[PDB]
Symmetry: D2
Subunit: 365 residues, 4 copies
Amino acid sequence: PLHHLMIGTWTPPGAIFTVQFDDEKLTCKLIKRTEIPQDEPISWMTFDHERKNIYGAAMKKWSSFAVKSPTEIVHEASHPIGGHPRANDADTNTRAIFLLAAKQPPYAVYANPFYKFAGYGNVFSVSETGKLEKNVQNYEYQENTGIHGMVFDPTETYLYSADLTANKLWTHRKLASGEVELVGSVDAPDPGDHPRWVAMHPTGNYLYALMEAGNRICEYVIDPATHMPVYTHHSFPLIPPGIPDRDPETGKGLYRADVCALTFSGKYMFASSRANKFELQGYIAGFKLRDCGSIEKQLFLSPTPTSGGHSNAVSPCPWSDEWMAITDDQEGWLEIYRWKDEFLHRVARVRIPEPGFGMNAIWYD
Amino acid sequence: PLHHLMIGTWTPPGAIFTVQFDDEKLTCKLIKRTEIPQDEPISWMTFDHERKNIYGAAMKKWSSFAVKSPTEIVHEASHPIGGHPRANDADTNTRAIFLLAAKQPPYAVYANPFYKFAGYGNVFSVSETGKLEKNVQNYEYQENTGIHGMVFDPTETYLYSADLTANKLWTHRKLASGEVELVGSVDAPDPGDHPRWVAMHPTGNYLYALMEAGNRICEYVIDPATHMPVYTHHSFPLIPPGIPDRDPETGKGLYRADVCALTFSGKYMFASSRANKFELQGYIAGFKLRDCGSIEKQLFLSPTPTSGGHSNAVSPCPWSDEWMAITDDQEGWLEIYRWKDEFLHRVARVRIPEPGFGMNAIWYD
Amino acid sequence: PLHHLMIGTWTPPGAIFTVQFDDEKLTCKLIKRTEIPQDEPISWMTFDHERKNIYGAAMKKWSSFAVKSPTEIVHEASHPIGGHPRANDADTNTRAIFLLAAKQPPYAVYANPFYKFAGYGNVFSVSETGKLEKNVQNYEYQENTGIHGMVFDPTETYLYSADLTANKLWTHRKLASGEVELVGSVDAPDPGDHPRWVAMHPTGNYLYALMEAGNRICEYVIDPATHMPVYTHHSFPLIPPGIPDRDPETGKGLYRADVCALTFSGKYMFASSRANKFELQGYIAGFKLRDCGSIEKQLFLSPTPTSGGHSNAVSPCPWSDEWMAITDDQEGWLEIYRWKDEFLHRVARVRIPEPGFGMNAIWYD
Amino acid sequence: PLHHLMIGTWTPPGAIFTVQFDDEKLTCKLIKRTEIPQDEPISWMTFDHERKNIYGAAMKKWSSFAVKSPTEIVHEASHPIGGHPRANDADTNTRAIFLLAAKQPPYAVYANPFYKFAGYGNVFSVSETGKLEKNVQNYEYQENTGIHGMVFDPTETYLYSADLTANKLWTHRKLASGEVELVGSVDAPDPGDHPRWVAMHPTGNYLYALMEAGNRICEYVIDPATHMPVYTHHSFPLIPPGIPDRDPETGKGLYRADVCALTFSGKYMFASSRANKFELQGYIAGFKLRDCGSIEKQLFLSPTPTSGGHSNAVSPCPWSDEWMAITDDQEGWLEIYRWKDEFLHRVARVRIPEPGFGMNAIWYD
Ligand SMILES: O=S(=O)(O)CCN1CCN(CCS(=O)(=O)O)CC1
């Protein structure tokens, strides 16, 4: 049978690419390059609850597209970054970086600007058709903030945010209106961690926080009393222990962890990290999760084909543990791996020669 | 070399027995029966920070003894139960059940009455010689309370209490004066658990709560933000899974978990449970602890020689992982086991033919 | 439902006891004491392939009984020990010690005399009804031999013998006639091991040898080229590591490993050892087996209620992993345990006040 | 400090390359290209017992070179292939493929021709200086034979050969003279395995056989009675389980396992396999070994940068577990990895633009 993935880019000209994966022949083909606002390339895209819409973090905009089929994607809107007044000036580096679409009513979209003037979250309501409708709220974090990823508890009552630059994890309560309200925050275990991503276990008992500079996954149990994550002291490496990781000409790290995501069954989780130089390899890791939610063990830590560039984002098939996609913008590959007997093996891939190609892949089909 | 253990009884006449253990010949000899107030038998005794005093939960009294040597124990005082007015009436079943001696200044002693009218904790200051001096505070829990065990975090800033009858874990802050102040509480995971004991990991990261009726050890990570324990959803059986445990002429259970305690190194923990009928065997269990504090695995779950009676309390040597003592008041044995290559084997024992003998052993030497 | 076990004795008067086990009420009742030749007590009994006959190692005789039901056991024959001329003299200590009944045609019975003048095996053919018919062969080992246990490969083409006094393992080929023929032998790994028992993995890939004086189970892979066992260098303790085990008035050991047996599924194996002094505890151990036959891990090593006396023989239910029986002749109990979630718990037991009672239990029903 | 590795080629012009590795700066530099007989390129080289000589499998010759320093390598001799008459004809594909230098007196060299007319082994004595002196013996295997690797037991009394084309493992006894004598052989477990390489555990208890077409490591216990390897039924994958491995235009395998080798401490073993197409990744694997010799577990199975070409040979530092080198002749890299906390990470590498560069690396320094 055929499957389809959409992928965005880190650089203009903006476009959404549709790749087709044949799980029988085990091949990859680009079947469509859908043009979108030239200056609104999408570095992070996500589907709404019925995969009838695609929302994207697009440079200075939060865009919305209606999807009729893998090859019919129509731009329906592009909103500006809310919160701090200067977030939209074309002279500030503020950038739309992450986006999350609620799967339960009212299906609102929660978005995070990044870099300077990013001390707020942007909440958007959607129309009866799922189009990004109106910025209904700009809730504040702190002057310092740089959220790079969020996740809801299974009930979508609590929203957790990974604050990379403020080095902390925030907890918000989602009101019935879709609007949020602060509950609290916790600093990351170490000053050098820098939370970038967070994933949720299906029971709602555990949360996993990926530390970008710390290159590791930290385990959190969710306190039912407050709904806030508490560190269990368990962490796992996202880069080989002891690997040289300091740029001599910068003292800044050579590796930056990327993304973590659970597979369909909830029994596993894949994570990745990228290298800051093209001659270095990035890494991909796998974990097994106990039914109550704690991390049982790290199954693997292996080199990726490239440094991953700005990506190396892994994307598990939402309906089956069997497949996992990964994108890189160093060379521009969309690769597809098979998860079998707890070992990963590549089965197909395609290279897309375009500027900034390879930011993240999402499954439709 | 010779070692010594003191043991109390569940029944009058009160007496403190000193047993001698030769770790070379691997033998046990009773070398002293120290008489104490006939009606103040000690069902739970503990040493002060220098093992120069022995404090005991003695029926209707909290007694204090000065210890010059294994054979020289001298009664120095006996205080009444504080808190509820009727706790001391000779017609109420209130009983002094557990006692804890702080190892950091001001070396106060925290005691817990049990059964009816036990909604308070009793704090005692001690003299310059370590004698129970004065009841400086009677802090309240709830009318419902029945604390049967407590433990301090490594810093002795926070005191955790196992509330058996109220089915919860309490957290208190210890002020510099030695007095406490409520922080909060959490209900046990299940209505049928009934916390009876709590142990602390040396890092202060984890706490272990032994559930009496639930016959299991539940793991708690300590939230550094509040100092309160949060359940990780990990538990371990203290009786064989599936074993018939309902008395058919009571519907009440047949097993009651007893005590849990870490070994000298902090790498292991032993726990036990007793049977409510003399023809049934009690059990002893062993666990290995990761350096961060979580429980790595259960090493063993084995039958004890007797049902354990009201005891089966395990007592690891405080200075070496190698030895562990256990007492029972069904037959009256003080047994000593050796812990070697993660297997336990009995090496010596002695029986004491006296009424209620065998409640708990404490190491001096 | 009701189940039945038969048990013999180490001492006269000879008798076969039938115990009934109710797996619903979890109780034990002796329901029959079948008298047999007064001076032919059975220290080791086994059923034929249809459980229509019981064969026994009975002091100076190899006896045969027809079984119509749990309470109807009829003596049909008693043969003398074959091999060395003096084996049968009433003045020698030679004794019928072990017996094995083939489950494939011709259903012959293979028996081992023990102590002095025991350098031969005794093979008996059986009648059309399964009665011990005639000693068809007395095959030799060495003058030195003392076989205490044997086992066939799943095909019943090769017979392995545990030579305790010669400290070795023998391999024989079984001809179609039922008679054997030597293939070879191997010394036990250590001079102090003394093979006493051997069990076979269902695939025929592995064999387990229990060392009596070595108090351990040694793993053997069967070489398909020769059909002989080759030690893999893996062994497991049958008594706690480091436990004092040297009688200081003898220099001989304090513990003697007993028997090992696989459960119905072939996934597990239980083993036991006994203490040579009544005040010491014997032990029972459990192991998990990989599908290919190697021993994955030791699940437990626990004290038995008594020293086990001359027995402590464990007997897994042949049709279900759920139950296991053990006998002892110190106090005379037949105990029944349940195997659940890889933990063992006693569920019923009965004591039999007779001389030498408690040698081994076999399941009928 | 500085270290040095020598590497050969799969293709003419023949040359030995000396690469320098700085373990402080973690860099690689080619510091010498020593020219050798143009038509004698070395596809497999090895050092003698003091690293004063280098012996090579060089196309139609077995060459010998004296080594004064990393940059001073002097050709001292080239012998023809012994055994079958046509092995040396320039019109036959027979090729010198593997070589092994004894480390105990008389320090003979054992060599294996490959492809057609390779039914013999070639034994060479060495001069008082370690130069390949004279072919003292051409011992036979079978018509069919194709030994691709051998290994001695720690004592250098028994020589084991991996017969790839005859699909078996041979055992030879080494006489004091250095000459050998057949002991026996065993077919590989499966017809599709094809033994290519064998490694030895320091205790001499176990031997590991790498199956080329089977893409797996099979474990063998060495029978002390015969000195022959017996399969334990334990095997580990050298390519991901389930990965497509059939060339539709050939029915022939897409993957071919390569080499296996223990690290300095004997606690670990690395192995590899190569892909038959340049667009496929090869694999590297790591195993942990129990002290008795069995394989405890597979630590990792990860993709290599290239298909490995004809190589992907891994070469652990003989004096420290910390480093491992790997060569490939697809792109021509000599990479160096660090083994730390049981994870592997690349630390340095250099590419050599020459024909057939990258067959295997050996450490001097
Ligand atoms: O369940 S039952 O009532 O049948 C047996 C209970 N049983 C009686 C014997 N003792 C040992 C006493 S001593 O032998 O160590 O003195 C352990 C407990």
